[PDB]
Predict the structure.
Amino acid sequence: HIWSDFTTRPSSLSIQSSKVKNYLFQKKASLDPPSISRRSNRIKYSPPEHIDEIFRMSYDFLEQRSSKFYELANKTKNPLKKDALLIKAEINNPEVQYNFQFNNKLNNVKDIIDYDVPVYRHLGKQHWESYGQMLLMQRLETLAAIPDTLPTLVPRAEVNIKFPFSTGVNKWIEPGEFLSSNVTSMRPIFKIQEYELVNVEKQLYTVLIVNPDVPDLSNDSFKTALCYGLVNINLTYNDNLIDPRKFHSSNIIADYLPPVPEKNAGKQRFVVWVFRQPLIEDKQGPNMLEIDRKELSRDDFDIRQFTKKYNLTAIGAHIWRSEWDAKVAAVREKYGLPPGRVFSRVRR
Amino acid sequence: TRITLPRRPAKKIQLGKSRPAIYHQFNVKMELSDGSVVIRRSQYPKGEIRLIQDQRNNPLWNPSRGSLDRFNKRYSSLFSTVELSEENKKKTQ
Amino acid sequence: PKSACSLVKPVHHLVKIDKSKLSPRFPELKYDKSDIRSPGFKPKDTHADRLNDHYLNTLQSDLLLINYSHNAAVVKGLKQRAWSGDSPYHLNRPPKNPRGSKAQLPDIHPIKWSNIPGLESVVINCFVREARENQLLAITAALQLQQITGCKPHPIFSKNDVPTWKLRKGHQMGAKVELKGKEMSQFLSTLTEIVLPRIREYKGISNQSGNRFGGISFGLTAEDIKFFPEIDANQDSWPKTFGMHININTSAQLDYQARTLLSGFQFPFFGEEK
Amino acid sequence: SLSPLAQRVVTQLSVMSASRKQPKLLKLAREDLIKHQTIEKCWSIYQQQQRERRNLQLELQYKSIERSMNLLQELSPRLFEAANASEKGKRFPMEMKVPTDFPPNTLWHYNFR
Amino acid sequence: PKIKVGVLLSRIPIIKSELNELEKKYYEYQSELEKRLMWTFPAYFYFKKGTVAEHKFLSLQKGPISKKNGIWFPRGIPDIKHGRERSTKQEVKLVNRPVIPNDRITEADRSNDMKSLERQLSRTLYLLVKDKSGTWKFPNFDLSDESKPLHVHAENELKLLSGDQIYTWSVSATPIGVLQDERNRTAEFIVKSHILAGKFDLAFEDFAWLTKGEISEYVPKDYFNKTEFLLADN
RNA sequence: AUUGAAAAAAAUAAUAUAUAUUAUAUAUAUUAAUUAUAAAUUGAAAUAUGUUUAAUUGAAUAUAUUUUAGUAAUAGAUAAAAAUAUGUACAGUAAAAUUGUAAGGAAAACAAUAAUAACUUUCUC
């Protein structure tokens, strides 16, 4: 009985609720489901017949399978293979399924869904692929944030942004949203959730928010603008919210300048990109990198060139898009930016 | 001229809400010609049927192994083979 | 409409966007029909299928043994022939159609452990021709079919028009039902045991019957349908009764293999084989 | 309004129809739902295993046949030829019936023809 | 090398295979799920109103509890259509003789008679034979003539052994496998064939009809390994 | 909430209530419904109140109050039978010819008829 053992196995694989666990594992269908909170509703409810004995048999079967997998898993040396074996062992565990399905994945509590555990991480990845990743990809393609900034994306990390400091309200930004200048007045907060097996201690990350749609009247086209640039950030599967708490002033290659779209300049895409650092062998600890702060410019910014220079690989992305409103002038004034231009309504 | 049942407005089955037609079926025991019983699910309400003419008593399915009745009844005293031999001269045809 | 020009734009990523999942319109429809949460849920594997079990145990190995031909290579079918490039008019020319046929024919593979012939599907086509006069006859035929199978029939409509036979276009006329898996197996078992022995001068299925590739068929008269136990048990309820065609579809490469398979399930075969 | 025949047709139609004959939807609790999932998944796995076992067995049989036929070809050509014939019209014997649920009165026939 | 003819006679099962403990329970659950989801029995069709047959059916049945005003129904209000609680599973209780099926276990099975053909009805029995030595094996025959085909020769040999009690059917002319060895420079080509209707009963001392699980016990280990896959598990 | 059975909570989504913000957000509670809709001196069922049989429950029967039966097709995002011919969103592929099959025949309906290298997941030697 491998799934009842918790000597070597993490605590997160168990259900933390006692009542639920008891309901799952009983000898007869006597008890009533903890999910149904109300007495009358519990009374009304009737579970399907014979479900218990069969369930128990299924558990035994899959428990045996897990145990067999574990016999292989411990003998394995290479890490990715071992992780895969672990996943195979525990993915069919009812308790872990319960944990994952019916508790929040975004702000996961460590005791319930631990992303340090490989199985839970795999589940989270699968969930991301099912909806959120596809949506992100659609928003990147439709809005034309990929070819315009950075050729392609192979989504690996789930990136979610927030604007807590400006207004007060709590809301994770859906990709391709129209945010007010009040909302995006102060800086955002990232959460880079990584689902691949990666060296947590060594692996650093960079985060770049880029505005491809600021108008350049000499060229009669647009230019990029690095609105916010962080480097050498340390992520951990559970500890992953990039906040002023975590990153230091040394990490900020270009400190947050807010979206201030001009009147009739149009809708401006702000597409955050998340890259992981190149990992160097034969060097213990996190390998930093120095950025030439005079070389990179904010008013015009070759993202692709920058990536080429520092050998980055874009793992994640997110995007919002701002256009002119009444408060952009106020935002500019607060930041000490100039009055802000006004263009002709007609694109002649 | 054409005999029909004229249609009423159709009931809108919404997408996702369509349910599969699980007809009411009883477990029915068929005893064949011999005593071999077989269970089959059936819509007609009859728990047990016993069959007279099956594959298990048909010569095609096992080669290795009431006018007539009325006639037999009312010509029984005579007992009607020997009778065939008696009444079968094959000269005239 | 400003234009009718259809032109799908290329993309800049290899992620496969399932558009259905991004909507919030049909939440019940996002679940698979196999899933318990879907309204489309049905218990599939309710009891042990008997004919299927028999096939698995006895027949399949025997069939494999029969069909072994030593160092048998693939026999390619009739395909679309390319032109020899002996003229510059061959250069963007469509390929010559197949030799005998207009349509291409499939390759016949050697039978191995993977591709042993087996039952794939049964279809019970009942087109009642008196229903050109009476629509109610089609309904009765459909009911009969349902009774026989334990499966939901689909209505057949008159696809064509013709004056000689008093037939309109778009008129409900009989019904069909594709049986698959366990219900189909049951239906076959009933046919073998109950119904076909009660047919008087029944020699069997013809050996000249069938597709060129793994499909065999035959038909039952209105006299033959009264032997089905669901119809037989209430002869008062069934005054009229309709014949039917029975298309058996196998996973057989050729038709003789399919015939052999059907014989394994106690179907008699009488005629001179091709 | 309607004839007796029309009525009977309507009744027949109703027998087939889902109109006012079907129950409520099968709702489950989350724990119950999980239990169901675990039952189904395990079953599916078991079925797959069984399929592989049977498939493997068939493959093994095929290999054995191949081994036999090569040997036969090597040794006795006539015997090999006899073995490797077209069995086009081969018919399973009508005595090899599909096993019933319960057995007959006379289990086995000792005499024949 | 000497050509020899192996023969294994396969008596096929005459009834359904016995379900596994896991399987049975699962099937019961699926049946109960079906019942829960099943439609109402349309009794109005199968039983005509104002008839003697209907009345008996009605008597057999018990009706559902209807909703009635001014009463608490703590299991929800009754949802009824065609006289069925929609919220629950429906149960419908139903020469003139009761169909009584025969016992699947037999007299032979009870006694453990290995020579009998009626001893296992749900399994595939295989004819085994014991030679002059203590070993068991599938019937071997010397093919000296080599004029006739191999499977036909095997069948003839079996018939000779029987004294024309046996009635066999060769599945094919192709041999299923070979048993070969270096000590005796021979080659036993194994044919497959099916006992249809007869005794065996009889150089060989003793015989038996056994399943795949019992053959392992009887026969040697190497021999079993050679010829395991040829035999059906059920 | 009362009723049955033998401290709590940690998703999505929906519903109810509240408030945050020149942000259709968050918090707490709960998981309803899901193929229905008026009109039935006649069928069927339940419950309540009586009476008789073997304090008791079953069984039978009377009245009252209800509930069911109006029996009608699509069950699938349906896909070349016929039907809403303009919008939008999602998805799919036709035809002919050939081989067959109960009446069926040149001509009614149904079935079948090009290739899987590589890739992902699952089980397995």
Residues 42-45, 49-50, 54, 58, 61-69, 71-72, 74-75, 78, 80-84 of chain E lie near RNA strand F (CB under 10 Å from a C1').
